[PDB]
């Protein structure tokens, strides 16, 4: 190899290829954002005329452009696919992907083989973006264009929430390790898909439309469809509803040989102005378009909602055939239905066709029972598709407080992890001071109160904005039993004690003030930090914002919450089994999901160690002589050249720190020592370990702690 | 190949290896910075107690630590090498490197082979960092410890300025293409060293101490010494003084086989706490130390300043021998001077020894005249070494306003590109208004005024902070003759007219107010921009900070300024010959040197195009019908899918943009079209090209313009 200039991507990872990349903690830096620090998308979206916007998108949909002529004179179905692909990268394992950042317009997603032609689709929406400007994000517009397409073609949707803020550089996400587009190095066993991945090959949305590994066996395709859609949060009813709903519209494109299609947009020359897949087959567009290489028109009304998809699926028998580009697809046997399927540019009629993955809906016995019913009950298909589409387009939006504008329906939905509305007045200063005292007199320790509040709050992830302390779900399944949370039972003592305090305060309170369990979990941590800070010679106040409410078990989907269980949390020195990478990488990944900067991660780790937040109160990294005192001791001792560190002879992922006596003075994990070893982290440690640093550390610690407590608090911002 | 998690370095660069890397415009992002937003290092260090600092460094220097015992009981010489290496990465071609940012403490420099053992040196200084905290940067401390070491051992320095601001992530710099440490792929012709490099091998500071590619020929080593030092701004006298003054102290380290030395710091395990090169030879340290693998002690007084180096160099005859580790060095012939050189830990005395590169100073005939003169007149050496050492450790400091504290000498130095002190009252609001009017009435066009101001101001580079509009050098050599500034002599007309306005203003002025030519150059741009924005319907005031002064030609080192000449300036659509990369890369590189973000670079390109700032007023990228009007037409037209772009038939770096008829409506360069093609830049173009975006564009353009006009204005910060 050769090293490149930095402007062509050269840097330190070339010389140390497996090095920790702290850039995941400064994604989307403010200086790359053109809008400026006062920009307030919620205030701008509030201003939009949604009816006019809807009419502007209908005009785009029926006005054919000569650089990509509209099949059947309507871009609606292309826009449904656009919207479906935008939301269709979502994965449950880490909550990454999905439409909430408009990441389809950036690398790598803008150039995935499965997003071929979406470069033209998005481009078609520039006239609408141009007219609304800062009032409308690309993120909102891409999925709103699909929703408007559904409605303009006869399908009434359940609603729509605006509010996705545009970003200015791509979210960098692990999409798999294959270095060849459409490569597959992600299966083992009989058919176990590598976590956290939710598609079958690199650069596909879910499955291969010619069947697993290009082999068109619809039964085997079904296995893939069911698993990838599960990992995108869809069950069997949702998955069938979505496939039938989508393929009610439009057509594939495979008019000619794919080797006449040129490079994807990130690799295409400048004069293409950000478009890719430039084709030399015929005109390269429209009648001659090549996108997937399959050539299927599913229904006899590609620009109308009706039940034709299932009528065709079940009204014909099917046989394998090949598309003009050499892909497997299915056609009706016996020459049936000849001429019945309309051409997108006024050519002659054609025969019924289907994808291998569409036959899956008839071959797989579970999907077969679901879709056979819809054959006779289209009203149920319509109901299921409206619910699954809404979920699809909003799955990564987070708490319903964030959904903006006039089309949000009011019905609660279990998948939104709903919390109750506030029903009483909220605690004010006096009531908060009082409850801080009760908590401090309750016999719960600093370590118990801080660990419990951290376990509640740090369950949030900023990818899909699920989790956090609102809801009080630490006392419900499954969080109440997660290993990191409740190692040996002590969690239930804390829960019971805080419940006793809620009960007494609520029995006696001023008027109509009541406090939730969820709020006391957080308030106990804050009170404990005030106590630890005193212990250390600081009179401080830890901010606290009331307003959390208490969800019930029935409002808490246990299976859905399973993906939020930490398998690693370096903030508590917890490392479970099954992580993809060593502990220091998992720490940064955890810090990234909590939206923490590197300074924020650093102070939190140092403060939580000395407060006793560790899992099972282990002494790893607890570099202090003081009990329950909030000092910068972690930083000071980490930097002390008087300590000689070595891996423990147990080979148990721990290290021993010996003083000059040769006595083991401290012990630590990889997560602990990385702050002393990594040159950029150790630079931060040196800020907090200096002699003048103690007030700064407390201030920064409290701010970072307050951030984590408020992560899910979109109800009050 | 395999794709990696982002936390392990994975990203879009893996799929498109040569993609333009926009991360070079958001380096050292605020979110990675642990210090306050209000944090002002200059304010902090300005209050430091320098005498106390000096005493504390002196105590570190004479207190041996067990994990790296001090040679001769004094770490001074090690610290001198440390400071010399911190400053010694500097290079004139781009101004990158040098000690100004404390980059030695981060990758890759902390792990360069030439920087072996300075991991320990920097670690020795943590007690001082700890004590002074935010009042003392690592960047200042590393070079200040070298300066104190010199004074501690009897050499009076010229002075010292504090104020180097710590950074939190490494500067990412092109250090060469070699992908092996000590690799050499950087020579062509007879011995032409690749620009912008200033070292003979990857990971060396300047030259190979065993001679060119390890051949210990002193005469040929002298060719490399002279050229690498020249590329670090040092002539023959300065180079000889630096080498002699440096090797007056301390010793090399090569006690044992180098294959017993473990991985460099960035590759070492966690338990070494950021140290590297752990050695299993004997104790690994002190008397068994292994750093370069050479074992040379130059003088009989390694912890004292005197004329021993040159007395030894000239008082013996030398013959080639091998160190314990097998490296080439020189030792006195015929057993002369046996036992005269003291051991670092009290062992037996040893014989005189020199590096091949030290013999260069005696064998090369230029150096021999210089150094024989110093053998005979040693007080001349002390004066040249003071001057040269001061220059070395301050070369990248920028304007002398940045130098802070009580050690800063008063004397003016040519290499500081000095400007006169302000000597009259400055123009205030009324005078600034009146001059704007007189400039707009002078007959000079908007294009001429914007071009001239841009030329003067955009010569600043934020690497070594040289250049900028202060000094009025646009009218002196060499700036007045640079091809990009003055293609066909139109600059001189502007200059004459602005001098006429200066002289008539000053001879009429109220009171003691006078204005400089340098201010009028910038003020003229500002007035042209107000005029152009009014033509487009905006009434805006362009900010303007007076106080630049006018240097004379005698105060302007013509050769030193040669390196500031642009060979590319995309903001003017100028591409000279000889650039290392295609024009869009050179554009972002110029933006990085201007300290611009991606939004700022974007608005400036689009504004400058329509203002007529292009070199030779070519129409490339001038996507407007209006003359001299500050509109957002660049962005609107770039996004016009009614234009079809193709490389021009002449293979000449340009494109033709044809409209519906097939007539050529626009032409543009690679720099113009990258904004339409690159997915991240096109996002920004889409902000500024929306129907609502004209006011925001004018405002952001004006703020970006102001930024560039004030780049070198450290006198008001
Ligand atoms: C097992 C899951 C799925 C598979 C294998 C699949 C496969 C495909 C393929 C290969 C294409 C053709 C692309 C081209 O050549 O132009 C296509 C188009 C389309 N997909 Fe699906 N799809 C799936 C699910 C969905 C879902 C869930 C939706 C929406 C809810 C959807 C909506 C569409 C639409 C409307 C089109 C037509 C696009 C146009 O008319 O230009 N698909 N799909
Ligand atoms: C042609 C240029 C130079 C070459 C090839 C060179 C080479 C070397 C080498 C190989 C070492 C041994 C490192 C080790 O094994 O510990 C060394 C040490 C040293 N260098 Fe030079 N050097 C050069 C210029 C300079 C300059 C300009 C200075 C300061 C102004 C300097 C100051 C020192 C000092 C003080 C030491 C001794 C460090 C100690 O005692 O630990 N050198 N140099
Ligand atoms: Na239909
Ligand atoms: Na000496």
Interface of B with A in 209-268 (CB under 8 A): 265-268
Partner-chain contact A134 B646, CB within 8 Å = no
The percent helix, strand, coil of chain A (3-state, each to 5) is: 45, 5, 45
Report the DSSP pairing between strands B664-669 and A568-569. unpaired
| Tokens describing residue A253 | 């494109």
Number of DSSP helices (H) and strands (E) in chain A, helices first: 24, 10
Distance CA A447, CA A618 (A): 11
Task: Please tell me the distance from the alpha carbon of residue A584 to that of residue A592, in angstroms, as a whole number.
Answer: 13
Burial of A15 (0-12, 13-18, 19+ CB in 10 A): buried
B656 lines ligand 2 (CB under 6 A): no
Tokens describing residue B323: 């160190």
| A85, A87, A120, A247: residue to mutate for ligand 1 pocket, most atoms within 8 A of CB | A247
The dihedral formed by the CA atoms of B624, B626, B630 and B636, expressed in degrees to the nearest 10: -30
Phi, psi of B78, rounded to the nearest 5 degrees: -60, -45
Question: Do B106 and B118 meet the contact criterion of CB atoms below 8 Å apart?
Answer: no
Instruction: Answer whether B623 touches A (CB < 8 Å).
Output: no
Three-state SS at B669: strand
Is A57 in contact with A145 (CB distance < 8 Å)?
Answer: yes
Helix (H) or strand (E) holding A59: helix A50-61
Q: How far apart are CA A147 and CA A141, in angstroms?
A: 10
Please state whether the peptide bond connecting residue B478 to the residue before it is cis, i.e. omega within 30 degrees of 0: yes
Q: Which of residues 563-582 of A touch B (CB under 8 A)?
A: 580-581
Q: How far is CA B356 from the centre of its chain?
A: 29
Angle ∠(A431,A434,A438) on CA atoms, nearest 5: 135
Contact status, residue B202 vs residue B178, Cβ threshold 8 Å: yes
Closest Cα to residue A106, out of B227, B63, B7, B681?
B681
Contact by Cβ (8 Å): A31, A37? no
Do residues B532 and B512 lie in contact, with contact meaning Cβ atoms separated by under 8 Å?
no
Ligand 2 pocket, residue B80 CB under 6 Å: yes
Tokens in use for A368?
């077969």
- Six-digit token pair at B475? 């009218």
- How far is A444 from A448, CA to CA, in rounded Å? 6
Q: Could you say which DSSP state residue B114 is in?
A: G
Half-sphere exposure of A16 (CA within 13 A, CB side): 21
Contact between A270 and B178 using a beta-carbon 8 Å cutoff: no
Distance from CA of B63 to the nearest CA of A (A): 14
Strand, coil or helix: what is A590? helix
CA distances for A17 relative to A534, B27, B32, B410, angstroms: 45, 20, 22, 48
Q: How far apart are CA B556 and CA B540, in angstroms?
A: 36
Contacts of residue A521, Cβ cutoff 8 Å, sequence gap at least 6: A452, A453, A456, A469, A472, A474, A498
Cβ-based neighbours of B153, under 8 Å, separated by 6 or more: B74, B76, B77, B249, B303, B304, B305
User: Touching check for A170 and chain B: CB below 8 Å?
Assistant: yes
Pairing of β A187-188 and β B353-354? unpaired
- Which is nearest to A162 in space by CA: A39, A35, A42? A42
Cβ within 8 Å of A, B 581-610: 581, 585, 588-589, 592, 597-599, 602
Give the integer Cα–Cα distance in Å for A3 and A14. Answer: 7
Query: Nearest CA of chain A to the CA of B549: how many Å?
Result: 32
User: A666 forms bridges with which residues in the sheet?
Assistant: A657
User: Which residues are CB-neighbours of B672 under 8 A, at least 6 positions away?
Assistant: B573, B605, B609, B620, B621, B623, B638, B655
H helices present in A471-573, as ranges:
490-508, 517-535, 558-561
Query: Residue A647's closest chain B neighbor by CA?
Result: B271
Is residue A277 in contact with ligand 1, taking CB distance under 6 Å?
no
Is the Cβ–Cβ distance between B562 and B480 less than 8 Å?
Answer: no
B205, B246 Cβ separation under 8 angstroms: no
Structure solved via: X-ray
Closest ligand to residue B308's CA? 4
**Interface mutation vs chain A, best among B134, B641, B693, most A CBs within 10 Å:** B641
- At the top level of CATH, the class of A570-697 is mainly alpha
- Long-range contacts of the stretch B372-377 (C-beta < 8 A, 24+): B372/B314, B374/B240, B374/B244, B374/B307, B374/B310, B375/B307, B375/B310, B375/B311, B375/B314
Q: Could you give the CA distance from residue A688 to residue A632 in angstroms, rounded to a whole number? A: 7
> Which protein residue's CA is at the shortest distance from atom 17 of ligand 1?
A252
Please tell me the distance from the alpha carbon of residue B525 to that of residue B436, in angstroms, as a whole number.
9
**Helical spans, DSSP H, in A125-203:** 126-132, 138-152
CB distance A135 to A47 below 8 Å = yes
For residue B405, give the nearest of B160, B145, B55 by alpha carbon: B160
Give Cβ neighbours of residue A260 (< 8 Å, ≥ 6 apart).
A279, A280, A281, A284, A290
Q: How far apart are CA B103 and CA B139, in angstroms?
A: 8
Q: Is the dihedral of CA A140, A145, A151, A154 positive or negative?
A: negative
- For B429-564, CATH gives 1.10.520.10
User: 3-class DSSP state for residue A115?
Assistant: helix
Residue A461, SS3 per DSSP: strand
Handedness of CA B345, B346, B349, B352 (dihedral sign): positive
A23 contact residues in B (CB cutoff 8 A): 6, 23
Resolution (A): 2.0
Domain covering A429-566: architecture:
Orthogonal Bundle (1.10)
Which residues of chain B are within 8 Å of residue A56 when distances are taken between CB atoms? none
Spatial separation of the C-alpha atoms in residues B377 and B371, rounded to whole Å: 9
Sheet holding A318-322: strands in order across? A318-322, A328-332, A353-354
* Ligand 1 pocket check for A84: Cβ under 6 Å: yes
d(CA B338, CA B351): 5
Which ligand ends up closest to the CA of A226? 1
Q: What residues of chain B, 77 to 116, have a C-beta less than 8 Å from chain A?
A: 105-108, 110-111
What's the topology of domain A40-152?
Answer: Peroxidase; domain 1 (1.10.520)
Q: How far is CA A34 from CA A359, A663, A709, B30, B597, in A?
A: 48, 56, 29, 16, 9
Tell me the C-alpha to C-alpha distance, in Å, between residue A671 and each of A572, A608, A680, B10, B489. Answer: 10, 13, 14, 21, 64
Q: How far is CA B573 from the centre of its chain?
A: 25
Please tell me whether residue B222 adopts helix, strand or coil conformation: helix
What class, spelled out in words, does domain A210-264+284-388 have in CATH? mainly alpha
Subunit contact B673:A271, Cβ cutoff 8 A: yes
Residues A612, A451: contact at Cβ < 8 Å? yes
CB contact set of A298 (below 8 Å; sequence gap of 6+): A247, A248, A250, A251, A308, A309, A312, A353, A354, A358
Cα–Cα distance, A156 to A409 (Å, whole number): 13
Coil/strand/helix, residue A706: helix
Interchain CB contact of A676 with B (< 8 Å): yes
Mutate to test the pocket of ligand 1, among A154, A249, A250 (most ligand atoms within 8 A of CB): A250
**Tally of CB atoms within 10 A around B147:** 23
Q: What topology is assigned to B568-697 in CATH?
A: Peroxidase; domain 2 (1.10.420)
**What end-to-end distance do the CA atoms of chain A give, in Å?**
50
3-state helix, strand, coil in chain B (%, to 5): 45, 5, 45
At B547, list the tokens: 């106080």
Q: How far is residue B339's CA from residue B331's CA, in Å, rounded to a whole number? A: 12
DSSP string covering B424-444: SBPP-HHHHHHHHHHHHHSS-
**Contact at 8 Å (CB) between A107 and B15?**
yes
User: How many CA atoms are closer than 13 Å to the CA of A598, on its beta-carbon side?
Assistant: 33
Rounded to 5 degrees, φ, ψ at B575 are -130, 105
- CATH second-level architecture of B214-385? Orthogonal Bundle (1.10)
Chain A residues within 8 A of B19 when measuring between CB atoms = 8-9, 107, 266
Sorted by sequence, the CB contacts under 8 Å of residue B408 that are 6+ apart come out as B159, B160, B161, B400
Would residue B65 be called left, alpha or beta, if left means φ above 0 and alpha means ψ between -120 and 50 degrees? beta
Measured CA to CA, the distance from residue B106 to residue B195 in angstroms comes to 24
**CA separation for the pair B528, B451 (Å, rounded):** 10
B120 contacts in chain A (CB < 8 Å): none
Are A16 and B107 within 8 A, CB to CB? yes
Which residue in this structure is represented by tokens 């399959």?
A294
Confirm or reject contact between A180 and chain B (CB < 8 A).
no
- What span, in angstroms and rounded, lies between the C-alpha atoms of B156 and B153? 9
Three-state SS at A688: helix
The three-state secondary structure class of A279 is: strand
Could you tell me where the beta strands, DSSP code E, fall in B549-634? Answer: 568-569, 574-575
Q: Name the nearest CA neighbour of A112 among A164, A178, A60.
A: A178
Tokens standing for residue A343: 């051409």
Residue A40 makes CB contacts below 8 A (sequence gap 6+) with none
DSSP secondary structure letters along B344-408? TTS---B--EE-HHHHHHHHSHHHHHHHHHHHH-HHHHHHHHHHHHHHHHHTTS-SGGG-BSTT-
Please name the residue that has the structure tokens 């779900």: A473
Contact of A155 with A16, CB cutoff 8 Å: no
Question: What strands lie across the sheet with B664-669, from one edge to the other?
Answer: B644-647, B654-658, B664-669
Residues contacting B304, CB < 8 A, separation 6+: B153, B154, B249
CA B178-B184-B190 angle, 5° bins: 130
Contact yes or no for A34 and B592 at CB 8 A = no
Closest CA to B528 of B447, B593, B597, B471: B447
Domain boundaries, chain A: 40-152, 210-264+284-388, 429-566, 570-697
Q: Strand, coil or helix: what is B173?
A: coil
B247: annotated binding-site residue?
A: yes
> How long a stretch of residues is chain A?
717
Torsion sign across C-alpha atoms A684, A689, A692, A694: positive
What the block records as the tokens of B336 is 């002369």
Q: From residue A430, how far is each of A410, A427, A444 by CA, in Å?
A: 35, 8, 22
- What is the rounded CA–CA span in Å between residue A330 and residue A353? 5
Question: Do the beta carbons of residue A88 and residue A206 sit within 8 Å?
Answer: yes
Q: Is residue B489 exposed (0-12), middle (13-18) or buried (19+ Cβ within 10 Å)?
A: exposed
DSSP-H helix ranges across A364-444 = 365-376, 378-394, 429-440
Ligand nearest to the CA of B303: 4
Judge contact between B210 and B217, C-beta under 8 A. Answer: no
Dihedral angle at the C-alpha atoms of B82, B88, B90, B96, nearest 10 degrees? -30
The tokens describing B699, both together, are 């405002």
C-alpha A13/C-alpha B113 separation (Å) is: 17
DSSP string, B486-552: -TTSHHHHHHHHHHHHHHHHHHH-STTB---HHHHHHHHHHHHHHHHHHHTT------------B--
Instruction: Please say whether the beta carbons of A639 and A686 come within 8 A.
Output: yes
Q: Is B346 left (phi over 0), alpha (psi -120 to 50) or beta?
A: left
> Dihedral sign, CA of A631, A634, A638, A640?
positive
**Strands of B562-701, DSSP E:** 568-569, 574-575, 644-647, 654-658, 664-669
First to last CA, chain B: 49
8 Å CB contact between B123 and A641: yes
Q: Given the structure tokens 């050269």, which residue do they identify?
A: A10
Ligand 1, closest atom to CA A294? 15
Domains B214-385 and B429-564 agree in fold: no
Q: Which candidate, B595, B572, B539, B582, places its Cα nearest to that of B709?
A: B595
Q: In angstroms, what separates the C-alpha of A141 from chain B's closest C-alpha?
A: 14
Q: What is the C-alpha separation between A542 and B201, in angstroms, rounded?
A: 55
Instruction: Tell me the HSE value of B175 on the side-chain side, using a 13 A CA sphere.
Output: 27
B130 in A contact zone (CB under 8 Å): yes
């Amino acid at each position: 190899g050769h090293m490149k200039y930095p402007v062509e991507g050269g840097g330190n990872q070339d010389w140390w290829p497996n090095r920790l990349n702290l850039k995941v903690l400064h994604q989307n830096p403010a200086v790359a954002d053109p809008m400026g620090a006062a920009f307030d998308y919620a205030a701008e979206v509030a201003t939009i005329d949604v009816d006019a916007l809807t009419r502007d998108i209908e005009e785009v949909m029926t006005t054919s452009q000569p650089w990509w002529p509209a099949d059947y004179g309507h871009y609606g179905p292309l826009f449904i696919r656009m919207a479906w692909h935008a939301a269709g990268t979502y994965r449950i394992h880490d909550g990454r992907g999905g439409a909430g950042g408009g990441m389809q317009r950036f690398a790598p997603l803008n150039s995935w083989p499965d997003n071929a032609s979406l470069d033209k689709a998005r481009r078609l929406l520039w006239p609408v973006k141009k007219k609304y400007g800062k009032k409308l994000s690309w993120a909102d517009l891409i999925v709103f264009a699909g929703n408007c397409a559904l409605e303009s073609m006869g399908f009434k949707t359940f609603g729509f929430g605006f509010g996705r803020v545009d970003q200015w550089e791509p979210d960098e996400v692990y999409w798999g390790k294959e270095a060849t587009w459409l490569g597959d190095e992600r299966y083992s066993g009989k058919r176990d898909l590598e976590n956290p991945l939710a598609a079958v090959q690199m650069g596909l949305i879910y499955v291969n439309p010619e069947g697993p590994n290009g082999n068109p066996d619809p039964m085997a395709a079904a296995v893939d469809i069911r698993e990838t859609f599960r990992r995108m949060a869809m069950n069997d009813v949702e998955t069938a509803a979505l496939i039938v709903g989508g393929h009610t519209f439009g057509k594939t494109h495979g008019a000619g040989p794919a080797d006449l299609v040129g490079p994807e947009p990130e690799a295409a020359p400048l004069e293409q102005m950000g478009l890719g897949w430039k084709s030399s087959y015929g005109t390269g567009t429209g009648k001659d378009a090549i996108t997937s290489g399959i050539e299927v028109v599913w229904t006899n009304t590609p620009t109308k909602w009706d039940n034709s998809f299932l009528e065709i699926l079940y009204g014909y028998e099917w046989e394998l055939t090949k598309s003009p580009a050499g892909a497997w697809q299915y056609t009706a046997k016996d020459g049936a239905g000849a001429g019945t399927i309309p051409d997108p540019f006024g050519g002659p009629g054609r025969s019924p066709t289907m994808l291998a993955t569409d036959l899956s809906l008839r071959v797989d016995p579970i999907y077969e029972r679901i879709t056979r019913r819809w054959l006779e009950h289209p009203e149920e298909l319509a109901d299921e598709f409206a619910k699954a589409w809404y979920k699809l387009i909003h799955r990564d939006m987070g708490p319903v407080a964030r959904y903006l504008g006039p089309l949000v329906p009011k019905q609660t939905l279990l998948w939104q992890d709903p919390v109750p509305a506030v029903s009483h007045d909220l605690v004010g200063e006096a009531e908060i001071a009082s409850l801080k005292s009760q908590i401090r007199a309750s016999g719960l320790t600093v370590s118990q109160l801080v660990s419990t509040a951290w376990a509640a709050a740090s369950s949030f992830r900023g990818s899909d904005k699920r989790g956090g302390a609102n809801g009080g779900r630490i006392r419900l399944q499954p969080q109440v039993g997660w290993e990191v949370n409740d190692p040996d039972g002590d969690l239930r003592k804390v829960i019971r004690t805080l419940e006793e305090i809620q009960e007494s305060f609520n029995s006696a309170a001023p008027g109509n003030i009541k406090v939730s369990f969820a709020d006391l979990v957080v308030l106990g941590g804050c009170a404990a930090i005030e106590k630890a800070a005193k212990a250390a010679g600081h009179n401080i106040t830890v901010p606290f914002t009331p307003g959390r409410t208490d969800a019930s078990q029935e409002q808490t989907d246990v299976e859905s919450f399973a993906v939020l269980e930490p398998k690693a949390d370096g903030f508590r020195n917890y490392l479970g089994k099954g992580n993809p990478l060593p502990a220091e990488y998992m720490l940064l990944d955890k810090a990234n999901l909590l939206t923490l900067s590197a300074p924020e991660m650093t102070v939190l780790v140092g403060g939580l160690r000395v407060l006793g937040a560790n899992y099972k109160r282990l002494p790893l990294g607890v570099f202090t002589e003081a009990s329950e005192s909030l000092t910068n001791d972690f930083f000071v001792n980490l930097l002390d050249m008087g300590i000689t560190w070595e891996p423990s002879p147990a080979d148990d992922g721990t290290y021993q720190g010996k003083d000059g006596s040769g006595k083991v003075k401290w012990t630590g994990s990889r997560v602990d020592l990385v702050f002393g070893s990594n040159s950029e982290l150790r630079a931060l440690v040196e800020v907090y370990g200096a002699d003048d640093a103690q007030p700064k550390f407390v201030q920064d610690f409290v701010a970072a702690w307050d951030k984590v407590m408020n992560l899910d608090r979109f109800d009050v911002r």
